[model samples]
Target: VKVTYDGVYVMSVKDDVPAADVLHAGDLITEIDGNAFKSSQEFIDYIHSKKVGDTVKINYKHGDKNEQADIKLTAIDKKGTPGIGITLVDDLHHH
Candidate 1:
């Protein structure tokens, strides 16, 4: 399974993936592993630091409430690095 898109917008979630069962599109990802980032690149870099099958705590806001979930990292493709199974974009525009 794979989650793909544009910065950190949660464009889509793949079925059977950890994030698919826990996270939804439009949820603004606020932090990962107890840390907040100043830019999307920073967040992506942090995620890249983890290995596949590793579970990381993800903090996000959906609408008015802040929520947290443990999302397991997985490979996007056969040769890709592991990542949380949710796609993202830098902006609010849905795509």
Candidate 2:
């Protein structure tokens, strides 16, 4: 598939995770805490920079409307990857 967007696209949300209640499978994250990111890894690193249980404001697109949410960072895995439990990929306005 081809993606033409400058943000990270959410592929799925893990059940029982913090993001499961706040995010969706088809959402696209455009910013975090009012700052825009150029890549998925950038966003990942940004999230990892914060401690667990820290709340962050995320701006995203949900269907036809732009939406935002305050999500608490969680330890997504045993190794403690700080995240909201979303499976996302970089969709940097690519063809």
Candidate 3:
């Protein structure tokens, strides 16, 4: 089974908006222009839905505050690869 994108988690983007602060750790990206996410495939597909250089509103939550910023879509990856940069394991025993 292929793992899907869960909107609950996201890798960090390393840049800042024009007049906004750079995103930090532990932030939750809540919405992409009022559209909430459910899966990783949806997330990837959504990013690919836009052309590079298209402005997008990245609505994120930091602590108790919700912040919205306009960002231009950048390369998801130069090469086709997806990773979370963390070590995860599934330790389930099913019948």
Candidate 4:
């Protein structure tokens, strides 16, 4: 993951994750649900606060420009809650 001049970059994504189908590795997440996030935690926390079956509007950058995607959050536990399955980092060299 790397922050050039836009937003937080996606470090990785799980293969079976629903968000994986929408958000790809190396994409820059600039905003979530139309709100601009200043840090990785902000973006993550916002997602964590949403309920399962919620569709999140993502504003991201890939290659040369920006794009949008509606990603449905998925449950990560027995509680039937949902989340976007992916990892993020500020360090480009992180693995």
- Evaluation by lDDT, superior candidate among 1 and 2: 2
How would you encode candidate 4's per-residue C-alpha lDDT over 1-95 as one tens digit per residue?
A: 66654667888877786787877888888988998887776776787799978889989988887889898887766766456777677643111
Model 3 lDDT-worst window of ten: 86-95
Clashes of each: 5, 1, 5, 2
Per-residue lDDT tens digits of candidate 3, residues 8-65?
4333434432212534556666667578877545655566666756666778777788
Instruction: List TM-score per model, in order.
Output: 0.80, 0.85, 0.60, 0.78
- How does model 3 score by TM-score? 0.60
Clashes of 3: 5
Worst 10 residues of 1 by lDDT: 86-95
Q: Whole-model Cα lDDT per candidate?
A: 0.73, 0.80, 0.50, 0.76
Residue 33's lDDT in candidate 3: 59
Summarize candidate 2's per-residue lDDT along 1-95 as a digit string, tens digits: 66554788888788787788888888888999999987777888888898878999989989989999998888877776677888776432110
Ranking by TM-score: 2, 1, 4, 3
Which residue runs does candidate 4 get wrong by more than 4 Å? 1-5, 77-81, 91-95
Top TM-score: which candidate number?
2
| Candidate achieving the largest lDDT | 2
Residues 39-94 of candidate 1: C-alpha lDDT, one tens digit per residue? 77788778788888888998887778888889888886676677776666653311
Q: What overall lDDT, based on C-alpha atoms, would model 4 receive against the true structure?
A: 0.76
| Cand. 2 Cα-lDDT | 0.80
